[PDB]
Amino acid sequence: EIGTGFPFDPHYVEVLGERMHYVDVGPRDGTPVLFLHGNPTSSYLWRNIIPHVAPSHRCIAPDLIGMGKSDKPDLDYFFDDHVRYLDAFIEALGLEEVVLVIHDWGSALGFHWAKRNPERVKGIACMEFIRPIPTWDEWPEFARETFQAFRTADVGRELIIDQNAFIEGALPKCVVRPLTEVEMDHYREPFLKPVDREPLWRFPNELPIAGEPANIVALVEAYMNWLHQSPVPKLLFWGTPGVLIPPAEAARLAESLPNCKTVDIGPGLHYLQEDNPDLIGSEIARWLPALHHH
């Protein structure tokens, strides 16, 4: 079955005046595997995947600014704020070449960094990542209303900040098996005080849906252009029915993305790590050795 503990020693690093928490295990020689969570999650989302990979490779899984066990400065938490902190995080640890394991807003941060540091990416493992959703018709029906409501300064603040609906509502609804209360409490913990939920609200207001916001739609389009023509080894996990990346779109991507291997996870929605962590972890470890050469 799936484990609910988080048996990792904390590591902390001062970045732009703020302390960021991260996981750090595995050997210190060789290429590190850098794990990037999104909304409303943290390193806790990678807990059952990292132990498949750490036997062979350094695993670094940071908590984004405002999230996890990282500090909570009073920010708008625009994507660009996460870009600044994440960039500084990576330089602070002296990372040179990396492999990237990425999801959701972690995938926006990770593709954006790769495009800008192409020579430092030896491979990308991705799942339920962010690319333009050009019309609301191209967002999943079952979540259209919910996300349209989230994308408002009145209703959307109400639901997400005041009633915690992204943690209590969206998260569990996008995992096919039922999250346990132990798991839910590890996800609830950073956001016990409502005022700290600002990143949970700004994030769905940053999604590139229906041309808006214009800056994110362009920056995402630019990293998707880069990806489509990069020969970097890519490993894409997908589920059924999925959310951002439904089966038919995973097949299309298998064909249109260079040097891409896809893996079918079975059932899942958005947080695929919670439904099949073992296959995700094992398939990643499997894949890493052949990335190593020049």
Distances (CA, A) of 88 to 15, 19, 82, 84: 6, 12, 10, 6
Q: Report d(CA 48, CA 54) in Å as an integer.
A: 11
CB of 130 to Cl ion, least distance (A): 9
Closest separation in Å from C-beta 8 to Cl ion: 25
Instruction: Tell me which of 57, 103, 112, 270 is the catalytic residue.
Output: 270
Q: Closest CB to Cl ion among 22 and 77?
A: 77
Residue 104 bears catalytic tag:
yes
The residue type found at 2 is I
Distance CA 276, CA 1 (A): 10
The residue from 128, 206, 274, 283 that is catalytic is 128
Angle subtended by helix axes 104-116 and 79-92, to nearest 10: 60
Catalytic residue status for 128: yes
**Active site residue: 104, 198, 206, 274, which one?**
104
CB of 163 to Cl ion, least distance (A): 16
Q: What length does the chain have? A: 294
Q: Which residues bind Cl ion (CB under 5 A)?
A: 39, 203-204
- The least CB distance from residue 203 to Cl ion, in Å, is 4
| Angstrom distance (rounded) from CA 170 to CA 175 | 9
Nearer to Cl ion, 123 or 204 (CB): 204
- Is 168 a known active-site residue? no
The nearer residue to Cl ion, 208 or 277, going by C-beta atoms, is: 208
Q: Over the Cα atoms of the chain, what is R_g?
A: 18
Supply 38's token pair: 């999104």
Q: Which is nearer to Cl ion, 49 or 108 (CB)?
A: 108
Residue pair 245/197 in contact by the 8 Å Cβ criterion = no
Q: Which residues are catalytic?
A: 104, 128, 270
